[PDB]
């Protein structure tokens, strides 16, 4: 393919003539993103150019990690790869990596910002998040920083999770992540979903804390003071002593917090916004909840193929990560344009 150069976001992009009319649509993880027109299929796409992907072993391994993760994802509610390219003609010149996926116009903040959402619409949005989470969790991939800005949404409210498995808002983070509690499982992401759903229903951030301590206080005012058993998970004595020292707070009745909401929404929120992660509902259990009855379809809530993450434990030299990444670029096989059939 012939490549052309264009200055975008103050740097030179080098892309195949296949992709035209590039225009910037914001930063992404470790890179910046352009919308483009794919002349081969007539589809709109988003192209992410990774920023200095082989600067250090940290950049090199995260480049490999992101390419491995995105090549594995084949789910309608999870960002996956349509293409990956480099202008390099050999490993010796290999220095830039571009990732291509379907174009999604907005993030979830652009859906809820200037719109009073209906309950049926909130159901659809949360249903999609949970469907994608069931899929990535089934491959032992956790998001760990799920938030509205990491939920890509198109013009028809179709949603995909992005930047999974990889100063930022902490308002949606699971408390065990934000506070570095010694144990955490895949339901960290379910706390985030609760936080997002609450905001879709009320138009207000649920836990808008100014710092870690302030946010924990807002959290404990909703869910109540924890039992001694959850202190088991907290390494620092100073943090444990602090929590133990706060005046006892009862759990609030969520029906008095989400006034006038679908009682089924309140019930689901009660199951998700639980301080102890071992008591939280899973994404797969949440999909069977009556709140989603009009959308739930067991035949269309698939799990993932096994995902080999053994590379995560390994320290390799920068040129080995670079070569492994080049291998994954060269071996990529684009999906068919149409991968779905009528039910
Ligand atoms: N507009 C749009 N459409 C799809 C994805 C993205 C995208 C990607 C991304 C990831 C992988 C890839 F291969 C290509 C692009 N990373 C961050 N974003 C965000 C850019 C602005 N915030 C919302 C989405 N942006
Ligand atoms: N925090 S609040 O008192 O501003 C508030 C705002 C909105 C709401 N709400 C509705 O109106 C419909 C569903 C829902 O949850 N509840 C509380
Ligand atoms: N997901 S759940 O519905 O099983 C569940 C489990 C436990 C709890 N909970 C606690 O842990 C302390 C207070 C409280 O209400 N809430 C919901
Ligand atoms: N955001 C709210 C009410 O505005 C604050 C007060 C109380 C506990 C948390 C969650 C709700 C209810 C913080
Ligand atoms: Ca899960
Ligand atoms: Ca269906
Ligand atoms: Ca089809
Ligand atoms: Ca069917
Ligand atoms: Cl694999």
UniProtKB/Swiss-Prot annotation:
Activated by cell stresses such as DNA damage, heat shock, osmotic shock, anisomycin and sodium arsenite, as well as pro-inflammatory stimuli such as bacterial lipopolysaccharide (LPS) and interleukin-1. InterPro entries: Kinase-like_dom_sf, MAP_kinase, MAP_kinase_CS, MAPK14, MAPK_p38-like, Prot_kinase_dom, Protein_kinase_ATP_BS. Its main location: cytoplasm. Residues 19-292 form the Protein kinase domain. It is found in: Cytoplasm; Nucleus. Signal peptide: none annotated. GO terms for biological process: angiogenesis; apoptotic process; bone development; cartilage condensation; cell morphogenesis; cell surface receptor protein serine/threonine kinase signaling pathway; cellular response to ionizing radiation; cellular response to lipopolysaccharide. It comes from the Eukaryota. The modification Phosphotyrosine is found at residue 307. ATP binds at residues 25-33, 48. The modification N6-acetyllysine is found at residues 48, 147. It catalyses: L-seryl-[protein] + ATP = O-phospho-L-seryl-[protein] + ADP + H(+); L-threonyl-[protein] + ATP = O-phospho-L-threonyl-[protein] + ADP + H(+). SMART domains: S_TKc. PANTHER family: MITOGEN-ACTIVATED PROTEIN KINASE. Component of a signaling complex containing at least AKAP13, PKN1, MAPK14, ZAK and MAP2K3. Within this complex, AKAP13 interacts directly with PKN1, which in turn recruits MAPK14, MAP2K3 and ZAK. Binds to a kinase interaction motif within the protein tyrosine phosphatase, PTPRR. This interaction retains MAPK14 in the cytoplasm and prevents nuclear accumulation. Interacts with SPAG9 and GADD45A. Interacts with CDC25B, CDC25C, DUSP1, DUSP10, DUSP16, NP60, SUPT20H and TAB1. Interacts with casein kinase II subunits CSNK2A1 and CSNK2B. Interacts with PPM1D. The TXY motif contains the threonine and tyrosine residues whose phosphorylation activates the MAP kinases. This is Mitogen-activated protein kinase 14. It comes from Mus musculus (Mouse). The gene is Mapk14.
């Amino acid at each position: 393919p012939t490549f052309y150069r264009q200055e975008l976001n103050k740097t030179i992009w080098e892309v195949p003539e296949r992709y035209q009319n590039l225009s910037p649509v914001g930063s992404g993880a470790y890179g910046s993103v352009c919308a483009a027109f794919d002349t081969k299929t007539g589809h709109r796409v988003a192209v992410k150019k990774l920023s200095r992907p082989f600067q250090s072993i940290i950049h090199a391994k995260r480049t490999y990690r992101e390419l491995r993760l995105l090549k594995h994802m084949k789910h309608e509610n999870v960002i996956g790869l349509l293409d990956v390219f480099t202008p390099a003609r050999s490993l010796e010149e290999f220095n830039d990596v571009y990732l291509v996926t379907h174009l999604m116009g907005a993030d979830l903040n652009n859906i809820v910002k200037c719109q009073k959402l209906t309950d049926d619409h909130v159901q659809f949005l949360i249903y999609q998040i949970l469907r994608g989470l069931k899929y990535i969790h089934s491959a032992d991939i956790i998001h760990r920083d799920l938030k509205p800005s990491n939920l890509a949404v198109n013009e028809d409210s179709e949603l995909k999770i992005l930047d999974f498995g990889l100063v930022a808002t902490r308002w949606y983070r699971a408390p065990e992540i934000m506070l570095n509690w010694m144990h955490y499982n895949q339901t960290v992401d379910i706390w985030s979903v609760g936080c997002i759903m609450a905001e879709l229903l009320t138009g207000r951030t649920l836990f808008p804390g100014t710092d870690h301590i302030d946010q924990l206080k807002l959290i404990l005012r909703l869910v109540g003071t924890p039992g001694a058993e959850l202190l088991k998970k907290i390494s620092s004595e100073s943090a444990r002593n602090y929590i133990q020292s706060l005046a006892q707070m009862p759990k609030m009745n969520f029906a008095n917090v989400f006034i006038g909401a679908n009682p089924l929404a309140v019930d689901l929120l009660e199951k998700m916004l639980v301080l102890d992660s071992d008591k939280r509902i899973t994404a797969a259990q949440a999909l069977a909840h009556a709140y989603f009855a009009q959308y739930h379809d067991p035949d269309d809530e698939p799990v993932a193929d096994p995902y080999d993450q053994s590379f995560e434990s390994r320290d390799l030299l920068i040129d080995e990560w670079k070569s492994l990444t080049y291998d994954e670029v060269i071996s990529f096989v684009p999906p068919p344009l149409d991968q779905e059939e009528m039910e």
